[PDB]
Structure formats: structure tokens, C-alpha cells
Design an enzyme around this catalytic site. Sequence first.
Site, PDB file in Angstrom:
ATOM      1  N   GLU A  56       0.809  -1.226   0.000  1.00 24.47           N
ATOM      2  CA  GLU A  56       0.000   0.000   0.000  1.00 24.47           C
ATOM      3  C   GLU A  56       0.849   1.287   0.000  1.00 24.47           C
ATOM      4  OE1 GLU A  56       0.210  -2.396   2.478  1.00 24.47           O
ATOM      5  OE2 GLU A  56       0.206  -1.434   4.437  1.00 24.47           O
ATOM      6  N   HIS A  88      -6.082   0.477   2.772  1.00 22.01           N
ATOM      7  CA  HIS A  88      -4.877   0.871   3.552  1.00 22.01           C
ATOM      8  C   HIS A  88      -4.595   2.381   3.554  1.00 22.01           C
ATOM      9  CE1 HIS A  88      -3.063  -2.618   5.247  1.00 22.01           C
ATOM     10  NE2 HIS A  88      -2.811  -3.234   4.099  1.00 22.01           N
ATOM     11  N   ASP A 134       9.621 -11.078   9.173  1.00 21.99           N
ATOM     12  CA  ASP A 134       9.331 -11.762   7.925  1.00 21.99           C
ATOM     13  C   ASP A 134       9.050 -13.233   8.189  1.00 21.99           C
ATOM     14  OD1 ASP A 134       9.563  -9.462   6.356  1.00 21.99           O
ATOM     15  OD2 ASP A 134      11.673  -9.899   5.823  1.00 21.99           O
ATOM     16  N   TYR A 167      -4.436 -10.832   9.444  1.00 18.45           N
ATOM     17  CA  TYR A 167      -5.465 -10.495   8.422  1.00 18.45           C
ATOM     18  C   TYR A 167      -6.807 -11.121   8.820  1.00 18.45           C
ATOM     19  CZ  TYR A 167      -1.612  -9.205   5.246  1.00 18.45           C
ATOM     20  OH  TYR A 167      -0.501  -8.622   4.654  1.00 18.45           O
ATOM     21  N   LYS A 170       3.032 -15.994  -1.215  1.00 14.81           N
ATOM     22  CA  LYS A 170       1.771 -16.713  -1.034  1.00 14.81           C
ATOM     23  C   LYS A 170       1.731 -17.984  -1.874  1.00 14.81           C
ATOM     24  CE  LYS A 170      -3.253 -15.994  -1.180  1.00 14.81           C
ATOM     25  NZ  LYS A 170      -4.337 -15.229  -1.817  1.00 14.81           N
TER      26      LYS A 170
HETATM   27  C1  LIG Z   1       5.319  -7.261   6.386  1.00 19.65           C
HETATM   28  C2  LIG Z   1       6.354  -8.143   6.654  1.00 19.65           C
HETATM   29  C3  LIG Z   1       6.441  -8.685   7.946  1.00 19.65           C
HETATM   30  C4  LIG Z   1       5.529  -8.320   8.956  1.00 19.65           C
HETATM   31  N1  LIG Z   1       5.639  -8.827  10.185  1.00 19.65           N
HETATM   32  C5  LIG Z   1       4.922  -8.270  11.366  1.00 19.65           C
HETATM   33  C6  LIG Z   1       3.897  -9.299  11.905  1.00 19.65           C
HETATM   34  C7  LIG Z   1       3.726 -10.525  11.270  1.00 19.65           C
HETATM   35  C8  LIG Z   1       2.772 -11.415  11.780  1.00 19.65           C
HETATM   36  C9  LIG Z   1       2.031 -11.086  12.887  1.00 19.65           C
HETATM   37  N2  LIG Z   1       2.213  -9.908  13.458  1.00 19.65           N
HETATM   38  C10 LIG Z   1       3.106  -9.035  13.009  1.00 19.65           C
HETATM   39  C11 LIG Z   1       4.519  -7.415   8.677  1.00 19.65           C
HETATM   40  C12 LIG Z   1       4.427  -6.899   7.389  1.00 19.65           C
HETATM   41 ZN   LIG Z   2      -2.689  -5.300   3.982  1.00 20.75          ZN
END
Ligand SMILES: c1ccc(NCc2cccnc2)cc1
Ligand SMILES: [Zn+2]
EC number: 3.3.2.6
Length: 607
Positions: free
Chosen positions: A268, A296, A372, A380, A562
Amino acid sequence: VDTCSLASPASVCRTKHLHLRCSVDFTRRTLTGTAALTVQSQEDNLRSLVLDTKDLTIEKVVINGQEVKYALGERQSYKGSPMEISLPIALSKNQEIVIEISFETSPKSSALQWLTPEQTSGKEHPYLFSQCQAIHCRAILPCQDTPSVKLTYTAEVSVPKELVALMSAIRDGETPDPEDPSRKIYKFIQKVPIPCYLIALVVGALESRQIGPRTLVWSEKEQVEKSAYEFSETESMLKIAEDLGGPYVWGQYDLLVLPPSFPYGGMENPCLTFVTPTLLAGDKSLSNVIAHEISHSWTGNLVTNKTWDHFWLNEGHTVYLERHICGRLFGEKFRHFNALGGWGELQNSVKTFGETHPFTKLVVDLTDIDPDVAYSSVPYEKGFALLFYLEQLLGGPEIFLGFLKAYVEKFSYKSITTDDWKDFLYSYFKDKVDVLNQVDWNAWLYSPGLPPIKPNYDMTLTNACIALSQRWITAKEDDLNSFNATDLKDLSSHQLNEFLAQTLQRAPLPLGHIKRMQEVYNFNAINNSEIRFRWLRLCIQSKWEDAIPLALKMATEQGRMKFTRPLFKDLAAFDKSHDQAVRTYQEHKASMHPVTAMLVGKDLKVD
Ligand SMILES: c1ccc(NCc2cccnc2)cc1
Ligand SMILES: [Zn+2]
Ligand SMILES: [Yb+3]
């Protein structure tokens, strides 16, 4: 406390503005230049501060016209190395100074992918793109790499004159480079304060086509026509998003369609959403990703998570808005269908991690965890499921959308935590507090596994998917003849996808079933990436050797994580393709996106 950042926190100082002046060197694969940070002290007598960096080469740091002392700390794995800067004069609270840092990136920058001409559509020019989320901005420039700080930015970018630069900002003109006539300088301005993870840069042989009053689509020439059509609903989605969220404040909403190694469905970046070319289904069927990126612009870019532990705020509210956009466009039965599919994907993610795994928690603790590695569908879909459950509890979508709009209004231009969100939820619905107190907050927010309560879903569009999936799972050999291409007659692409998703949840199926499915449905002919992804997974998990080259080809010809990660894992799990999977990974690794390369390698237990 942002446990992902090594920089001085917002309590100590805060970056107000970045001026980036840099030159893209394709021959060395480096970005070289200066980041001028305008930094405001939040403390009395401030004499030093610390910035994030990762694989950066620092030439010098200049304040008030003179070089100052700095020191790069020891590297802390994925977080990079802290850069401590000794200020020449102690600063009082609220005093602002400008710190100009001369730097150069590494070719191995985890923020960047450098593509050779043969890796592009046109085959003549190279191409570069960034992806800073979550904590890769420090791999491009020294900064407070935490979403708890928001800054404006301006940039001047020198590139070979035959190429085009774009950024997450408004285009502010182009000129020949006065220092090198083979080069052009593009200029950019981002006047709305943003967290640094939203800084983005693409450089390549880019063309554009207008597709709405505030939207151009950008790509290589060979993708422009297809993209203009695929994303033609963009303006209509923006209008609906603006009705639900309030004014669109960012000016332009352009789209950039990346080459196939782009690691996410979309990103976004403000003023310039980045998208995977795997969305180019030819029928607009994967346009929910555009709705998601548009959403977003409010949830994430206007109201932002304070730390990555609270990422679900960004994603859960975005999916919630995304699904409303889709419900307005295509009806409430359709919103429920996508919602119910999302619960399916949540079931999947939890099953994969295991129901007690800390990454299945809604609020996570990322102390010593690479973001990551933690990344998944949980924030989500667990986040969406929470909001959908609250919607049903609190009186329905109209009521809950009133809350969402007020929430965006309240926290615009701010960074917030879960407790901020919950506090405002209780304030907004203070006449429904007794209903709110019936929610199991600890389970929902802090416990692993599936949520304690599943929302209510309209089943209308999903029934035929479940029915057909069940026919196949319960079929015996002597039932196979009864299947026929007419079974798919009245199913949309979204329904074919849900049929495969339902069936894949019970994989493996007997090989004879899968062979029959190809015979009667010819799923091999479908190039819709979501459908093909699930079909190929079902084939591989059901041990069909014919599918091996198909799965290897899809895993490598595009790089959306994905799809590429689960395909490589499935191919690793199948004995007949295991060695090929590992070999193909090894051969392709050097030319993959750095993050994708790292993750697939871990998934495969390789290097
Ligand atoms: C793009 C890449 C990694 C992340 N990691 C933050 C994250 C992951 C899973 C659960 N909570 C927080 C977010 C965006
Ligand atoms: Zn998103
Ligand atoms: Yb039978």
C-alpha cells in the site's frame, strides 16, 4: 517499546522530514547519496541519538556544515547495526536540527531487488524495486525504522536517462542530471507524514496509462493494456472507500504492476500501490487485492500500528474495509462468502503453525523474532474475524462502519496500540459496554489458536462449493464416471477457487480422483493464479507426478510468496520431486528476491 528497531525511540527524538538525494547505479547495484533527516529532540540536553541501518556503507555524517563523530554498532542479525551519532551541540526539548548522512547500499540489501534486463518484460533494460515493510527501510537509508514515527519526505533520484523513477509520493518533475548527461533526475514530494516502511522506489522502463480521474497504471509496455483493463474498477472502489473511511488525503492513487518476483499481492505505498502481475487474470476476478490496497489509504497509512506487535490493527481493519467494498460492488451475500473463505484460510494457518503457536496470537511478541518469519494470514483473518464478530454483537454493519469511520478520524496521522483501539471501541460504544464486557478479550487478543467464537456467515454462495467438494471426497472409484464438466456450469471463478480450497483442506485425495478431476474439469487450462495455485497443491499433495513440472514452473516463473513458498514446500514433501525442488531452489536463489530467497531456504532446510 519497538523491539524490532535499534534506533532512539520516539520518546527521545523524532524524525520530522527526510530529504533523499540519491543515484541508482545499476552497474554496481547500489543506491548512493545522502539522507538529510530533520530531527526534533523530545528530551532536554540531548547529545546523541541512534539510527537503524542494515548493510549500509557510511561515508560521513554532517551537521551545521561540519563532519561529526558516529559509530556503527555490532550487527544484530536481521535488525542490522545501530548507528550512534554524537551531536555537536546539546539540544533542548523540541529543538530541530538537520543531520545529513552520506551513504551507499549493499547489492545484498534486503529492501531491494535488482533485475537484469532478461528478468524484465522488455529484455533491454534493467529494473529495480524496493519493499520496506516491515523493517527493510534501514536497508536503504539510515532512519528510525519504526512505524511509531511519522515523517514527510522529498527526494531527487538520478537514474539512467532511458529509465523512469517512481516513489510513494507525488511526482514533482524531471530534468537532465547536471553532473552526468546520460542521466535524468526525478523529483518527488510526500506532504502527508508517513512511517518509513511506506517509503518506496521503483526504477525501470515504465509506461503509463490513465484509467481514472486520479489513477494512472504504470508497468512495462507489454503489461500496460492488460493492467488498464484488469484494474478498471479502481476509481469506483476509491469512491466507495471514501464513503466508508472519509476523505482520501493522498492526492493521486496510481498503480504500479511489478515484475513477477514481487513478493506480495500488493503493497500500500502511498500514492503508488505496488501489485503483483499474478493479479492479471483477464477478468478482474482478483480485484479484491486492489480494494485491500486502497483501504490501507485509511487503515494502515493514516492510522498506523505503533509497533509490529500490533500489525493486526493495520490488516484486520483493512480486510474489514476491503470486504465492505466488495459487498457494495457485488452484494452482501458476496461479502459473507469472502468472509467465510477467510475463516477457512485462518483454519489453514493455525493448522500449519499448530494451535498453540505464538504466531497464531492476534497480538504477538516480536522480541528476537524476524518479522518476515512471523508473517502470515493470522493478523489479516484473525483480525477480520474479531471485527466481524463485533459487528454482529454491536448491531450490524451500518453501526460498525460508523465506528470504523470515527476510529479513522480519531487516530489519523497517529500511531497506536491495541489498547488505544480497545479504549476507543469502549468510548464509541459506551452505551453497549455490557455487550463489550461479554467478549473474551484475553482469548481473542492474546491466546493462540482459532478464536473462541466463530461469527455467523451467510452460506448461500458457499453451499455449492461444499457440496461438490464433498461429492469428490466421498466418491469411490465407481462414482468417478458421474463427474462431468457440467458440474462447474453455475460456479464463478470465486466458487471454483472455494471448491479447490475446500478439497485441498482434505488432501491427499486418491490419485485416480485427481486424474479424473483433470479429465472432466481441465483445471490444467486455468491460468487464474489463485485457482492454479490450489489445484497444483492438490495435485502434488495427492502425489501426481505429472503435476511436478507444472508446480516447479509456477513456483519459479513468479515469486509471490503466497504461492512460491507453499509450492516449494509441497514439492519438498513429495518424495519424487524433493531433490528437484531443492535443486531448482539452488539454481534460482541468486536471482530471487532476497526475502523470498531467505524464506524458501528456511522452508526447505537449505544452506
Ligand atoms: C510485512 C512483513 C512482515 C511483517 N511482520 C509483522 C507481523 C507478522 C505477523 C504477525 N504480526 C506481526 C509485517 C508486514
Ligand atoms: Zn494489507
Ligand atoms: Yb459404489
